[PDB]
């Protein structure tokens, strides 16, 4: 069909572009900080193990 009111290819392209931008921002943060684990989003058990090793 040739339709004007809905465009699905654009929706899917938007979602892919957003995923790529998120990944790039995460990498930029990790290079700026120098650490792999900046939150518990990253690795939760490693966070606690590293707190104990830090103590």
């Amino acid at each position: 069909a040739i339709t004007v009111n809905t465009n699905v290819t654009s929706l899917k392209a938007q979602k892919n572009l957003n995923t790529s931008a998120s990944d790039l921002a995460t990498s930029m943060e990790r290079l700026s900080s120098g650490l792999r684990i900046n939150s518990a989003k990253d690795d939760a058990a490693g966070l606690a193990i590293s707190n104990r090793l830090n103590s």
Binding site: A21, A25, M28, L31, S32, G34
Partner: protein
């Protein structure tokens, strides 16, 4: 004289700096400054994707 030597040793253990450790910390923070500068300069260019969509 004996006691003065031993007490000055004791005070030095508390007050004086360690050059071997402090130079290492300095070099680490130098490298981190250069990396963070590069990363911030690259971060300020993110709003330019909109011009592509526009």
């Amino acid at each position: 004289a004996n006691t003065q030597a031993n007490v000055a040793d004791a005070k030095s253990r508390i007050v004086d700096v360690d050059f071997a450790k402090e130079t290492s910390q300095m070099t680490k923070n130098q490298v981190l400054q250069q990396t963070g500068s590069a990363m911030l300069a690259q971060a300020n260019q993110l709003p330019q994707v909109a011009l592509s969509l526009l």
